[PDB]
Write a protein that binds this ligand. Structure first.
Ligand SMILES: *[C@@H]1O[C@H](CO)[C@@H](O[C@@H]2O[C@H](CO)[C@@H](O)[C@H](O)[C@H]2NC(C)=O)[C@H](O)[C@H]1NC(C)=O
Ligand SMILES: *[C@@H]1O[C@H](CO)[C@@H](O[C@@H]2O[C@H](CO)[C@@H](O)[C@H](O)[C@H]2NC(C)=O)[C@H](O)[C@H]1NC(C)=O
Ligand SMILES: CCCCCCCC/C=C/CCCCCCCC(=O)OC[C@H](O)CO
Ligand SMILES: CCCCCCCC/C=C/CCCCCCCC(=O)OC[C@H](O)CO
Ligand SMILES: CCCCCCCC/C=C\CCCCCCCC(=O)OC[C@H](O)CO
Ligand SMILES: CCCCCCCC/C=C\CCCCCCCC(=O)OC[C@H](O)CO
Ligand SMILES: CCCCCCCC/C=C\CCCCCCCC(=O)OC[C@H](O)CO
Ligand SMILES: CCCCCCCC/C=C\CCCCCCCC(=O)OC[C@H](O)CO
Ligand SMILES: CCCCCCCC/C=C\CCCCCCCC(=O)OC[C@H](O)CO
Ligand SMILES: *C/C=C(C)/C=C\C=C(C)\C=C\C1=C(C)CCCC1(C)C
Ligand SMILES: *C/C=C(C)/C=C\C=C(C)\C=C\C1=C(C)CCCC1(C)C
Ligand SMILES: *[C@@H]1O[C@H](CO)[C@@H](O)[C@H](O)[C@H]1NC(C)=O
Ligand SMILES: *[C@@H]1O[C@H](CO)[C@@H](O)[C@H](O)[C@H]1NC(C)=O
Ligand SMILES: CCCCCCCCCCCC(=O)O
Lengths: 304, 304
């Protein structure tokens, strides 16, 4: 083992020189210089200050305008709510932690940071499953109305909770990653008390691979077989591409670590993909404004 | 108005073509195909056949083992009893009604179905209030013993009856919902003879908002402030999450209808949430077996 395992942490740094301290006890300056922690804090402050207004505006515009009741409108409203939980429930702890160089709030802080990021990302992924099904129904006509959209919304919360909640209560656990200022699922240690190995296989099969199979099955039908529907289909394509850009680096590094436990990697290895993935709280409403004329017009109408 | 109001019903279907009939007089096949009603009957048959043994077994094991006398054990015993009232007092009417496509038993059958489901759901909510307070006292030490647990049990019946009983005797009323095979509180009509509007405000304030405020106050004190106690605290978290998944869709759709009476919704709109919420009779013992090692071992000992 090239790192330092403690009771509830795995630091990617050798303790041969005796300098490692728990990320719940002391700033982690032995593994990165203070200016690097400051860069994480500046980044998180930007995400909060952009993320709160843009998601709140999306929520407000949608509720105000009764014409915005297609399945796409409902799904984007649901994403705005999930994004606001990411920002206030998790990112406020990411910022405080990065400011101090360690999880001042202890494991409770780590649970908040990991839980709300996992929940938000999985609501986004299962939302893309709902939209892929909706597009496949509408275009291929093998009708998806408001009732189906609302049922789809409730479905995304149930699937997302089935991924994000077990590590709070004894199946796997949330543990600090990278420079130790964010938390994720424990890919690092076997920790039989929490049955870590079976949770990770469950997560990658049920909450990554199966959703992507459905999305690409639906897309294969669309491709390998009016103007308003085209606009929606084009936007969903970009939402799926943006999701893969956002999360594939994190998913690949996580799976690498899981299959190479204790190997020689350092704190920067997981820091960059883990913090890049937090853009997930901001980008979907940006796509929305650029790619949906009706929503953009309503937003301009309300804001002006 | 987009639906059809009668003396004691509100059918979410227009009578502009003359086909609407009272759900106490004739099968409701004008608003849904016979196979849809058959899915409701099959679902209810499953809930009864699972619901009776799993709740009876929980009751039996608890009474047979004198070691199971913590506040959690008393509260789960109370839920098992309330669940059995839901299954035999209410769901037997849901099943018979769904088989025939209307309330063969008339308003009396509607009262049974609505009363026992409301009672069972409110016993669960007020039980979570009791557990939240017990966790707050136990963990934050601001002692919750056996006398307090039993007092809490009696309290949950009194509060639940203060919600479920008035619509039997002239404050609001039970009325069929959705495909007309379950009954709920009258969100649909003003019906001033039974003072409908004031009851709905009373129900949502006293019997939804106030309990939730207490639970999240206690949880917040938990978060911003041993192994055996941790297991109990984790189970209570999952009981609260499961309750919200089960009941929030129903509460949301009911409040939407109350504030948009006569609006253009169909029979499927309330059917799905109202029938999904009936899983409330089954799911708590399943959590118990999965998340309490002492109870699980006692059950295996009893069963084998
Ligand atoms: C890294 O190694 C150091 C040196 O062995 C550990 O610090 C010692 O910890 C023991 C047990 O807590 C104490 O009795 C010693 O006094 C400590 N020595 C010094 C110099 O502090 C340290 O705990 C290790 N870090 C981790 C995370 O395990
Ligand atoms: C829906 O409209 C039909 C047609 O008007 C109603 O049926 C009539 O009801 C009156 C009053 O009972 C009878 O005198 C007529 O003979 C009925 N006509 C037919 C063709 O059956 C029906 O009652 C309405 N449904 C509801 C629930 O109000
Ligand atoms: C469709 C658009 C997609 C756009 C996005 C494409 C992302 C491509 C990269 C993925 C990360 C894969 C991570 C694999 C990690 C292997 C690392 C490794 O072997 O490194 C050993 C070393 O010891 C470590 O410090
Ligand atoms: C903590 C975990 C929670 C998980 C569970 C989350 C549930 C989300 C569902 C909300 C239903 C709200 C209903 C709102 C009704 C809107 C109605 C509407 O706008 O359309 C009416 C139309 O007539 C239709 O046919
Ligand atoms: C605690 C858990 C909270 C979950 C909240 C979910 C929101 C989805 C919103 C969709 C509601 C449907 C539109 C209703 C409306 O705004 O009209
Ligand atoms: C929907 C939310 C479901 C969450 C379920 C978690 C069960 C975890 C069980 C862990 C048991 C530890 C012993
Ligand atoms: C109307 C009916 C409402 C029933 C409500 C009773 C709840 C069970 C509470 C029982 C608490 C004590 C149980 C003791 C027991 O079962 O055995 C003790 C030896
Ligand atoms: C495992 C399955 C999870 C899906 C759970 C889905 C729960 C859906 C509840 C019903 C609902 O939200 O329906 C709202 C709509 O307005 C009327 O159909
Ligand atoms: C996990 C539970 C999921 C929810 C279970 C709800 C009750 C069963 C629904 C019957 C369909 C009746 C109407 C079908 C109309 C299709 C359009
Ligand atoms: C900054 C904090 C983060 C990234 C914490 C946790 C994130 C996860 C456990 C992500 C899981 C995944 C998602 C959301 C979707 C793609 C695949 C996945 C299972 C790795
Ligand atoms: C299948 C039959 C049903 C769902 C009948 C009635 C249910 C209610 C009137 C439920 C009320 C509520 C409960 C129990 C808890 C959440 C809030 C609530 C007031 C909507
Ligand atoms: C630690 O790193 C060395 C060098 O890369 C490697 O040979 C060794 O296998 C690693 N330890 C583990 C447990 O993988
Ligand atoms: C019935 O539905 C139409 C179309 O949505 C709406 O304009 C009308 O206001 C509704 N009636 C009521 C009483 O809400
Ligand atoms: C646009 C910039 C894209 C940044 C990709 C971030 C993840 C890269 C993974 C690097 C690593 O393995 O540490």
């Amino acid at each position: 083992m090239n790192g330092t395992e403690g009771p509830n942490f795995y630091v990617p740094f050798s303790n041969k020189t005796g300098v490692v301290r728990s990320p719940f006890e002391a700033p982690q300056y032995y593994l990165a210089e203070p200016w690097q922690f400051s860069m994480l804090a500046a980044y998180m402050f930007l995400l909060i200050m952009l993320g709160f207004p843009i998601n709140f505006l999306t929520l407000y515009v949608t509720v105000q305008h009764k014409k915005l009741r297609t399945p796409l409108n409902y799904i984007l409203l649901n994403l705005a709510v999930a994004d606001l939980f990411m920002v206030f429930g998790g990112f406020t702890t990411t910022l405080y932690t990065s400011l101090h160089g360690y999880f001042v709030f202890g494991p409770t802080g780590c649970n908040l940071e990991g839980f709300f990021a996992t929940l938000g990302g999985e609501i986004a992924l299962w939302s893309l499953v709902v939209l892929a099904i909706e597009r496949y129904v509408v275009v291929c006509k093998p009708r998806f109305g408001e009732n189906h959209a609302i049922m789809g919304v409730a479905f995304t919360w149930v699937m997302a909770l089935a991924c994000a909640a077990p590590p709070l209560v004894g199946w796997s656990r949330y543990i600090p990653e990278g420079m130790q200022c964010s938390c994720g699922i424990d890919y690092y240690t076997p920790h039989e008390e929490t049955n870590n190995e079976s949770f990770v296989i469950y997560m990658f099969v049920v909450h990554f691979i199966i959703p992507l199979i459905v999305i690409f099955f639906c897309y294969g039908q669309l491709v390998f077989t009016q103007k308003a529907e085209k606009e929606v289909t084009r936007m969903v394509i970009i939402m799926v591409i943006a999701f893969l850009i956002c999360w594939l680096p994190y998913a690949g590094v996580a799976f690498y670590i899981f299959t190479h436990q204790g190997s020689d990697f350092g704190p920067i290895f997981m820091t960059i993909p883990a913090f890049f993935a937090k853009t997930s709280a901001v980008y979907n409403p940006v796509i929305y404004i650029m790619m949906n004329k009706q929503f953009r017009n309503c937003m301009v109408t309300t804001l002006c």
